[PDB]
Amino acid sequence: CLSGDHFYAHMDKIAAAESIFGERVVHGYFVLSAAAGLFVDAGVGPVIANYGLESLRFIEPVK
Amino acid sequence: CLSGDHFYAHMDKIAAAESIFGERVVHGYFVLSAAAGLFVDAGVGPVIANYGLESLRFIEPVK
Amino acid sequence: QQLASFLSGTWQSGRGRSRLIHHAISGEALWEVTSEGLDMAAARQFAIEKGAPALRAMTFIERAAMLKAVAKHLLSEKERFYALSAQTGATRADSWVDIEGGIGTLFTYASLGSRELPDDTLWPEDELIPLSKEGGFAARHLLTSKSGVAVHINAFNFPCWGMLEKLAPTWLGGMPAIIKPATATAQLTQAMVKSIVDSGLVPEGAISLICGSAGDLLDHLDSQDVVTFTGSAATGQMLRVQPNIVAKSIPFTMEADSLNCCVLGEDVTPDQPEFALFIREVVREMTTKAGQKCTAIRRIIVPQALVNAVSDALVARLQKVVVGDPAQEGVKMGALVNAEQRADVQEKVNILLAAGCEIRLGGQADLSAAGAFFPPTLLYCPQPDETPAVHATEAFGPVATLMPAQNQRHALQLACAGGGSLAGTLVTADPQIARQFIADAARTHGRIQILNEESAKESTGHGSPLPQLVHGGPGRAGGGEELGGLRAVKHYMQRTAVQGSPTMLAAISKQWVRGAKVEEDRIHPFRKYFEELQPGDSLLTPRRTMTEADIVNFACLSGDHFYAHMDKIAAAESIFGERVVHGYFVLSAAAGLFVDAGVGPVIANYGLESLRFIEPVKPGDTIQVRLTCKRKTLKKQRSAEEKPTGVVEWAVEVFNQHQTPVALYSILTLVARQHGDF
Amino acid sequence: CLSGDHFYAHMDKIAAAESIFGERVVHGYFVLSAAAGLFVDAGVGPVIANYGLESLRFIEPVK
Numbered sequence: 018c019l020s021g022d023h024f025y026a027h028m029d030k031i032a033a034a035e036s037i038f039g040e041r042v043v044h045g046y047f048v049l050s051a052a053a054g055l056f057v058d059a060g061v062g063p064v065i066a067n068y069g070l071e072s073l074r075f076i077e078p079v080k
Numbered sequence: 081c082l083s084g085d086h087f088y089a090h091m092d093k094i095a096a097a098e099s100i101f102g103e104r105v106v107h108g109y110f111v112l113s114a115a116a117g118l119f120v121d122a123g124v125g126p127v128i129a130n131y132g133l134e135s136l137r138f139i140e141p142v143k
Numbered sequence: 144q145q146l147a148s149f150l151s152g153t154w155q156s157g158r159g160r161s162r163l164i165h166h167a168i169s170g171e172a173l174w175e176v177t178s179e180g181l182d183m184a185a186a187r188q189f190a191i192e193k194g195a196p197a198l199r200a201m202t203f204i205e206r207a208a209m210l211k212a213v214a215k216h217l218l219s220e221k222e223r224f225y226a227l228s229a230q231t232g233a234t235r236a237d238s239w240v241d242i243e244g245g246i247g248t249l250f251t252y253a254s255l256g257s258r259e260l261p262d263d264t265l266w267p268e269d270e271l272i273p274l275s276k277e278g279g280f281a282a283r284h285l286l287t288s289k290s291g292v293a294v295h296i297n298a299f300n301f302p303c304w305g306m307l308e309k310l311a312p313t314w315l316g317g318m319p320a321i322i323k324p325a326t327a328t329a330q331l332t333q334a335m336v337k338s339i340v341d342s343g344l345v346p347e348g349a350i351s352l353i354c355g356s357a358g359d360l361l362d363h364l365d366s367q368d369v370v371t372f373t374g375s376a377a378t379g380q381m382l383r384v385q386p387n388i389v390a391k392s393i394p395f396t397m398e399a400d401s402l403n404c405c406v407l408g409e410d411v412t413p414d415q416p417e418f419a420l421f422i423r424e425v426v427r428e429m430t431t432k433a434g435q436k437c438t439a440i441r442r443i444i445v446p447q448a449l450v451n452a453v454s455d456a457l458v459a460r461l462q463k464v465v466v467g468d469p470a471q472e473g474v475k476m477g478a479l480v481n482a483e484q485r486a487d488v489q490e491k492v493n494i495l496l497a498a499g500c501e502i503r504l505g506g507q508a509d510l511s512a513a514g515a516f517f518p519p520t521l522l523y524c525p526q527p528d529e530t531p532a533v534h535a536t537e538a539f540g541p542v543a544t545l546m547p548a549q550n551q552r553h554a555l556q557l558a559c560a561g562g563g564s565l566a567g568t569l570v571t572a573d574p575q576i577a578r579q580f581i582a583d584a585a586r587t588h589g590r591i592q593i594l595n596e597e598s599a600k601e602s603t604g605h606g607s608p609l610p611q612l613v614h615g616g617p618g619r620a621g622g623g624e625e626l627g628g629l630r631a632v633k634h635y636m637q638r639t640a641v642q643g644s645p646t647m648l649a650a651i652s653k654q655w656v657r658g659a660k661v662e663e664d665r666i667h668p669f670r671k672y673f674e675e676l677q678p679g680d681s682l683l684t685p686r687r688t689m690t691e692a693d694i695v696n697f698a699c700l701s702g703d704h705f706y707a708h709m710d711k712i713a714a715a716e717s718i719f720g721e722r723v724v725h726g727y728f729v730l731s732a733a734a735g736l737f738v739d740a741g742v743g744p745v746i747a748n749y750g751l752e753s754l755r756f757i758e759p760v761k762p763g764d765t766i767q768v769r770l771t772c773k774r775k776t777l778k779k780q781r782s783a784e785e786k787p788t789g790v791v792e793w794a795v796e797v798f799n800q801h802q803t804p805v806a807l808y809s810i811l812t813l814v815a816r817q818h819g820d821f
Numbered sequence: 822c823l824s825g826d827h828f829y830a831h832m833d834k835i836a837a838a839e840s841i842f843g844e845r846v847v848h849g850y851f852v853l854s855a856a857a858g859l860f861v862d863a864g865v866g867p868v869i870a871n872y873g874l875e876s877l878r879f880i881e882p883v884k
C-alpha cells in the first residue's frame with residue numbers, strides 16, 4: 018500500500034500459486050527497508066548519509 | 081513507522097536542521113520503493129522476480 | 144389586413160369567409176384571419192417528408208441545443224412580443240408572465256434535454272430487464288420518435304406560452320409541429336412563428352402555422368401523428384369523436400377547462416399570516432390576466448365560521464383593483480380579449496346567479512363599451528352541496544365563487560366535487576391536514592399547491608404551470624398531461640420493448656448492457672479521449688486478495704468500526720457468519736484496480752450512479768474488477784474558457800475467485816474531449 | 822496508499838495545479854468513507870447490512 022508496488026506475487030493469492038514462489042512473498046524492498054529498520058541507530062552520531070547501495074542480490078524468498 | 085528506520089535526519093526536526101541537509105529529508109529506501117511503486121505493472125506478465133539490484137547512488141536529497 | 148398562415152415553407156393566406164381580430168382595449172379590427180383554400184394535405188406532406196427526417200437525424204443533445212438557440216433568439220427580441228401582447232388587453236406583468244414563461248419553458252427543456260437525454264437518435268429509458276437465467280436473452284425499452292406530425296390546437300389565453308410549451312417537447316421528441324392557434328389572438332402566435340422561422344436555427348418544415356380554421360387537417364392524419372388540444376370541454380369532446388382520430392387511433396391529448404378549488408383550512412385564524420396570504424393568493428390569482436387563465440381560482444372553499452371574515456377581506460382587497468388601460472398608470476387588472484368573451488363570461492355569471500347569490504359587482508357589465516372590460520366578481524353559494532351548477536359552470540374571467548365547508552370533511556368533498564380539476568390549493572400550517580387533503584383530493588387535481596408561510600416567500604403562485612411539473616388533471620380538465628419534465632417528450636415517442644441478446648441490445652442502444660461483447664484493446668480506457676471511447680471498451684484489472692489487515696486498516700482509516708468488521712464474536716452471530724470486508728473498501732479497492740495514475744483525459748469523478756452489494760467479501764477472498772464503458776453523452780462547453788469535455792459512464796463489475804459478482808455498480812466520470820464545438 | 826488510487830489530482834503536486842481543481846483534492850471515496858466513519862454506530866444494533874448506495878454526486882472538491 019505505502020510503496021504503491023501492487024505486484025501480483027505480493028497482492029494476489031491466486032497468481033502467486035501459479036508463479037515460481039508457490040505462495041505470496043514479502044517484497045524485496047521491504048526486506049531491504051526492514052533491514053535498515055533493524056540496524057540503523059536513531060540517535061545523532063557520526064553517520065551522516067546513505068549515499069548508495071553497492072550490490073544487492075535476493076537469494077531466497079521471504080514469506 | 082513501517083520500515084522502523086528512525087534516523088535523525090528523518091524523524092527529528094532539530095537535528096535535521098543541524099545536519100548536512102538543512103531540514104528533514106525523505107528516506108532513500110522510500111525513494112527506491114516509491115519508484116518501484118511507479119514503474120511496476122500489477123498484472124500477471126512475463127516479469128517473474130526482482131532478483132536483486134546492480135547499483136545505486138542517492139545523488140541529491142529528496143524533501 | 145391578412146394574418147398570414149405558414150404552410151409548406153411559404154407564408155400563405157386563406158381565401159374565404161374571414162373572421163376578424165378585435166383589439167381588446169379599444170375595440171377596432173386590426174387583423175382578420177382566414178385559412179380557406181390552403182392545401183393541408185400538402186402541408187402535412189411537406190412536414191413529414193422534409194422536417195421530420197431533418198429532426199430525426201439530429202441527436203437529442205443537438206435538439207436541446209437547438210431549443211436553447213431558439214430561446215436565446217426569442218429572448219433577444221422580446222420587445223415586439225410585448226408590443227403584440229399589449230393588443231390582447233394584458234398588462235405588462237401579465238404579458239411578462241406569458242412571454243417569459245414561454246421562453247423559460249424553452250430554456251428548461253434545453254437544460255433537461257442536455258442533462259438527461261443521450262447523445263443518440265434513440266433513447267433507452269430502462270436500465271435492463273434480464274429475462275433469462277443464463278443471461279443470453281434480455282430486453283430493454285427503447286423510445287424512438289414518431290415519423291409524423293404533432294397538431295397543436297391552442298386556446299386564446301397564452302399565445303406565446305401555450306404554443307411554446309407544446310413546441311418544446313415536440314421538437315425535443317423529433318417531430319414537426321403544425322400549430323393551430325386560436326383566431327382571437329393569433330397575431331402574437333404569428334410573431335413567435337415568424338421570429339422562429341426567420342432565424343435559420345430550426346430545419347425547414349419543422350414548424351407550420353394555420354391562422355384560421357384547420358378544416359381539412361384532422362381528416363388527413365396518419366397513425367404516427369399526435370394531436371394536442373387546448374380549449375373548452377365542449378370543443379375537444381367533439382374533436383375526440385372525429386372519425387379519422389378514432390379510426391387511425393392517434394393520440395388525442397385533450398386538456399380542458401377546470402373549476403379550481405382553493406381550500407382554507409380549519410387551523411387558519413384571521414390573526415395569522417396564513418389568512419393574509421390566503422386572501423393575497425386568491426386576489427392575485429383572480430386578477431392575473433383578468434382571470435383568463437385555466438389555472439385561476441374559481442371556487443373558494445372556506446370554513447363555516449370564517450365566511451364573513453374571508454368575504455370582508457376579499458371585498459376590502461378587491462375594491463383596490465383598478466380595471467383599465469394597461470399603458471396608463473395606476474391600473475392593476477387589464478381587460479378581456481373580445482366583446483364575445485365578455486358576453487360569454489356574463490352569460491356564465493347569469494347561469495351561476497340562476498341558482499346562487501351575490502357579494503360584489505357581478506353581472507353589471509357594460510356590453511356597449513369600446514373595450515372588453517369586466518369587473519372583478521366574487522360570488523356566494525350558501526348551499527354548496529345542493530347546487531350542481533356551481534360545480535359544472537366556469538365563468539372564464541375575474542369571476543370566482545365562494546362557499547362554506549364543515550371541518551375538513553366537507554371541504555375535501557367540495558374540492559373533489561369539481562368533476563376532475565387542475566391546480567388545487569390548500570392553505571394550512573398543520574402538516575397532517577395537508578396529508579389528509581392530498582390523500583383524498585389528489586384524485587381530481589393535477590397539481591396541488593400547499594401554501595403556508597414558508598412557501599409564500601418564493602412561491603411561483605397558483606396559476607404558474609411549471610415546465611417540469613405535470614400540467615393537467617382528470618375528468619373535466621381533459622385527462623391529458625403536459626409539461627411533466629421528460630414525461631412530456633414521451634407523448635411524441637413510441638415506447639418499444641426490444642428483446643434480444645445483450646450483445647445485440649448494446650449495438651441497438653449504442654450503449655453497453657450487462658453481458659455484451661467487450662473490446663479489450665491492450666491499452667487503458669482511461670488513456671483514451673472522449674471521441675475514441677466506444678461503449679463496450681472494457682478492462683479486466685489485476686486482482687487483490689482481501690485480508691484481515693485490509694479490514695483493519697480501512698476500519699481504522701475511515702473510522703467505520705462496525706461490528707461485522709471489527710468484532711469476531713458479533714460477526715459470528717450476525718447474518719454474515721464471520722467478519723466481512725467493508726463495502727466501501729471494495730468500492731475503493733476497485734478504483735485502486737482500474738484508475739490510471741497518469742495525466743490523461745479523465746478529469747473528475749462526478750458521482751456514482753447506482754451501487755448494490757450482492758455477496759459479502761471475506762478475508763482470503765480475491766477481488767477482480769471489470770471496468771467497461773457504457774455511455775458517453777457529451778456536455779456542451781458553456782463558456783469559451785472551459786475545456787471541451789463529456790461525461791462517460793462506466794459500468795463496474797467487481798467479482799471474486801468464484802466469479803460471482805460482488806458489488807456491481809456504475810460510476811460516472813468526466814472525460815475531456817479532443818475536439819470541441821466552438 | 823490503502824485503496825491504491827494514485828490519480829494525479831491526489832498524488833501529484835504539479836499536475837493538480839494544471840488541473841480543473843487548482844491543487845490536490847481529497848478522494849471522493851475518502852469523503853464517502855470518512856462520512857461512514859462519522860455516522861456509523863460501532864455497537865451491535867438493528868442495522869444489519871449495507872445493501873448498496875442509491876445516488877452519489879460530488880458537488881464541490883474537498884481539499
Ligand SMILES: CCCCCCCC(=O)SCCNC(=O)CCNC(=O)[C@H](O)C(C)(C)COP(=O)(O)OP(=O)(O)OC[C@H]1O[C@@H](n2cnc3c(N)ncnc32)[C@H](O)[C@@H]1OP(=O)(O)O
Pocket residue numbers: 053057064065066067068087089100105106107108137138139140141142
Ligand atoms: C540505511 C543505511 C544508511 C544508514 C543511515 C541512513 C541515512 C539516510 O537515510 S540519509 C537519506 C537521504 N540521503 C540521501 O538521499 C543522500 C544524499 N545525497 C548525497 O549523497 C549527497 O551528495 C552528499 C552530500 C551526502 C554526498 O555527496 P558528495 O560525495 O559530497 O558529492 P557527489 O557529487 O554527490 O557524489 C557522490 C556519489 O554520487 C555519484 N554521483 C553524483 N552525481 C552523479 C550523476 N549525475 N550521475 C551518476 N552518479 C553521480 C558519484 O559517483 C559519487 O559516487 P562514488 O562514490 O562512486 O564516487
Ligand SMILES: CCCCCCCC(=O)SCCNC(=O)CCNC(=O)[C@H](O)C(C)(C)COP(=O)(O)OP(=O)(O)OC[C@H]1O[C@@H](n2cnc3c(N)ncnc32)[C@H](O)[C@@H]1OP(=O)(O)O
Pocket residue numbers: 024026042043044045074075076077078079116120127128129130131
Ligand atoms: C521492483 C522491481 C522488479 C519488479 C518485479 C518485482 C518482483 C518481486 O518483487 S519478486 C519478490 C522479491 N524476490 C525475492 O524476494 C526472492 C528472489 N527470488 C530468487 O532469488 C529466486 O530464487 C531466483 C529464481 C531468482 C533465484 O535464481 P536461481 O535460478 O535459483 O539461481 P541462484 O544462483 O540461486 O540465484 C542467482 C543469484 O544469487 C546470487 N547469490 C549470491 N550469494 C549467494 C548464495 N550464498 N547462495 C545462492 N546464491 C547467491 C548469485 O550471485 C546469483 O547472481 P548472479 O547471476 O549475478 O551471479
Ligand SMILES: CCCCCCCC(=O)SCCNC(=O)CCNC(=O)[C@H](O)C(C)(C)COP(=O)(O)OP(=O)(O)OC[C@H]1O[C@@H](n2cnc3c(N)ncnc32)[C@H](O)[C@@H]1OP(=O)(O)O
Pocket residue numbers: 705707718723724725726727755756757758759760804807857861868869870871872873
Ligand atoms: C454504511 C452503512 C451503515 C454501516 C453498515 C455496514 C455493513 C457492512 O459493511 S456489510 C459489508 C458490505 N455489505 C454487504 O456486503 C451487504 C450484504 N450483502 C448482501 O447483498 C446480503 O446478502 C443481503 C442480505 C443484503 C442480500 O439480501 P437478499 O435477501 O438476499 O436480497 P437479494 O435480492 O438477493 O440481493 C439484494 C440486492 O442485490 C441486487 N442485485 C443486483 N444484481 C444482482 C445479481 N446479479 N444477483 C443477485 N442480486 C442482484 C438485487 O436486485 C437486490 O436489490 P433490489 O432490492 O434493489 O432489487
Ligand SMILES: CCCCCCCC(=O)SCCNC(=O)CCNC(=O)[C@H](O)C(C)(C)COP(=O)(O)OP(=O)(O)OC[C@H]1O[C@@H](n2cnc3c(N)ncnc32)[C@H](O)[C@@H]1OP(=O)(O)O
Pocket residue numbers: 258734738745746747748749810812813828830841846847848849878879880881882883
Ligand atoms: C474513481 C473514478 C475515476 C476518476 C479518477 C478520480 C477522480 C477524482 O477523484 S476527482 C476528486 C473527487 N471529485 C470531485 O470532487 C468532483 C467534484 N464535482 C464537481 O462538481 C466538479 O466541480 C466538476 C469538475 C465535476 C464540475 O462539475 P460541473 O460541470 O460544474 O456540474 P455541477 O454544476 O457541479 O453539477 C454536478 C452534478 O451535481 C448534481 N447536484 C445534486 N445536488 C446538487 C446541489 N445541491 N448543487 C449542485 N449540484 C448538485 C447536479 O445535478 C449535477 O448532476 P447531473 O448530471 O444530474 O446534472
Ligand SMILES: NC(=O)c1ccc[n+]([C@@H]2O[C@H](COP(=O)([O-])OP(=O)(O)OC[C@H]3O[C@@H](n4cnc5c(N)ncnc54)[C@H](OP(=O)(O)O)[C@@H]3O)[C@@H](O)[C@H]2O)c1
Pocket residue numbers: 296297298299300305323324325326327355356357373374375376378381382398399400401436437539565615620621
Ligand atoms: N391546459 C388547459 O387545460 C388549458 C389551458 C389554457 C386554456 N384552457 C381552457 O381554454 C378555454 C378558453 O379557450 P378557448 O375559448 O379558445 O377554447 P375553444 O374556443 O373552445 O377552442 C380552442 C381552439 O379550438 C379551436 N376550435 C374551436 N372549435 C373547433 C372545431 N369545431 N373544430 C376544430 N377546432 C376548433 C379554436 O379555433 P377558433 O379560434 O377558430 O375557434 C381554438 O383554436 C378555457 O375554458 C380554459 O379553461 C385550458
